[PDB]
Amino acid sequence: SGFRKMAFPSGKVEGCMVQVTCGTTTLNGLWLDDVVYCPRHVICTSEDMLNPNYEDLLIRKSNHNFLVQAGNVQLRVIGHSMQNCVLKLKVDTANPKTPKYKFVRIQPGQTFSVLACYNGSPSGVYQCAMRPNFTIKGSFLNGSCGSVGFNIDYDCVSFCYMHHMELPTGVHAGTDLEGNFYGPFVDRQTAQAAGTDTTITVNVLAWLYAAVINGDRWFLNRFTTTLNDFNLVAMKYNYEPLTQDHVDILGPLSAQTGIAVLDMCASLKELLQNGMNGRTILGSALLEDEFTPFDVVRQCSGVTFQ
């Protein structure tokens, strides 16, 4: 038993991280097959960032302007191109440690692991969620750009995030590996801000199920509700709507614990309307929303990766 904020094992991703330097900027790249992916803003000076014309800035660069290092070994860049907000540097050597992988775009509410890197060297791993406002609450310093987020299924790494920037409130924004930003953010030095965020209702419910599985039951009650009535409460408390698909996804946890989703929703309604009365749930005094239903099932059943 026990329940922790748990990341995927990061080894398959560690073997893909390299250092990319253009001019005076160093950041990280992802080396898969014979291509290194990194943020396109690596090519910009500070002045360029004010109003960058990335296609003109890139024609001005040559292969030799990009220094790529895998550990102590230099990788020769033999071509370059842009895909949306990501730069693809073709190198002369395919990464012999390339795992089975795919590029996926995730939806708000979905979680993933971040391998925070500096100078091409993995430094730490932690678990995040794509917030409803399309930011992530990361932990990133200067030089972290190009660090990636991922999930694993069996033996396949699904890369879903590449890090590009920090916003004024201290949260983070980035792209999928096809270079499309999550959220209405752009890679230029102009005013931008995180929108008002909301709480990921289906994830809170999943974590309440994790709590019950781990013996924490004090918030259970005799009451149930309807999807329509609970969604009025959710809106009042800046919680995301709960859909029938969310209810269906939580079916396994309901059957296992004997607490129907709408029964658990009546628990969550009372917690929102009345608070915790000084108690905790799974060692938290807040309602945790960065575990998905699948995260709960995975951790509580001991799923492993090959």
Added chain:
Amino acid sequence: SGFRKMAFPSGKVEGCMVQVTCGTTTLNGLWLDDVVYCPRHVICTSEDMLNPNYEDLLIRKSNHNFLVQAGNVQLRVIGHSMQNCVLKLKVDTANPKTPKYKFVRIQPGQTFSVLACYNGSPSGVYQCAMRPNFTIKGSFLNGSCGSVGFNIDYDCVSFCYMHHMELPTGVHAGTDLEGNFYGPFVDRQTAQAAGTDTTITVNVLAWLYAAVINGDRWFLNRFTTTLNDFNLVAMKYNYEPLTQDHVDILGPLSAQTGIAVLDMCASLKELLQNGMNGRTILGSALLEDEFTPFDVVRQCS
């Protein structure tokens, strides 16, 4: 900016995890060079566990009674020895993925990453602390034994924990990699309650410094305290004593933020007296005690 429970990248440890089976029991082993380390209780039946004589049980085992599997490859056991509560299985193949490593026994309050594994394969990685009562608050199921805890400061893996058991209160107990248990626990099915746990004061102070570094000041105050008055108060909340060693180790964070250590202690005293009044610190509504001073410097700088 930001502040997360951050584990070390797990790849160097993933490359060391194997499956060990003896009789009907399967757990994980750690394969370093030509040795596989695992909990010695792998050799016990359910009956053996009340009062097992491990020396007597082990002398009866042949090398072929141990099935060791590294991915899809069976490793051949060629000898075995017992060191305290760890079994060392000598195998005929050395692990080509052995990282630079050392074994370190840690003190209460120290943190480490856990790579939770089942059947020799990794499930996930999370951060833990050695509690003052020598338990860890893990996430471990049947078959997780032999999973290890570690740090990887400066490219060398320091192995500090191997998992052996869950206690009735839902926390976890295990050994260093020399097989010595942390705390009063034993690998026997006899009663062995953990002491009342306490909060790791030096770590709470480190986390308050992290909050200041990340831009929050709401909990600061104009007061200070003597060290002894702070300890007299903090102990009434089941906080651990703060020693002069702890004050010294907080010096760099104090210098970076301009908040004297004893002034931060006055902040913590007020937080214990008042609560947060609907506010949060680094996304928590509780005082967090599983980040060390070293961890804060690692992550914020």
